[PDB]
Design a protein around this ligand. Sequence first.
Ligand SMILES: [Zn+2]
Ligand SMILES: [Zn+2]
Lengths: 77, 83
Amino acid sequence: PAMYSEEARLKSFQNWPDYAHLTPRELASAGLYYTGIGDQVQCFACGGKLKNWEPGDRAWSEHRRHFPNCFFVLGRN
Amino acid sequence: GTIYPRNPAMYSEEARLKSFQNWPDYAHLTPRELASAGLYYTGIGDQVQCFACGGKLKNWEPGDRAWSEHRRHFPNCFFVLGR
Ligand SMILES: [Zn+2]
Ligand SMILES: [Zn+2]
């Protein structure tokens, strides 16, 4: 329940690496929080994990691409 | 990509189906059902593994379905969530 809050997902992004190609805000808004390693993030609703973000990737697009049956993704759509 | 299968070669359902060549005769689930749910035989007992999430399942019981057990134990699997 700690990660339901978009604000609490932001706070997980302490130690988010400076190289990473997306921001804590964008990720948190798409339901994702930092797992604490690399540039890996996880969804608070489906638990799906995403990493190795590339320049130009968007948080929502990848989240919906790989975890289409996530309830949060299904509502966003 | 932003996701990555635990076992790329078992990416293929056909490759997964072939892994059941020596599936034991006591194991009641069919290779067809298991492979369709992303699972391939590890070669040990009745233990299968998902090519996507890498989760393992074994000690199957009557009325167990492959997809149901896969989703129950590994609900955040991209194969489960892409189905
Ligand atoms: Zn999700
Ligand atoms: Zn899986």
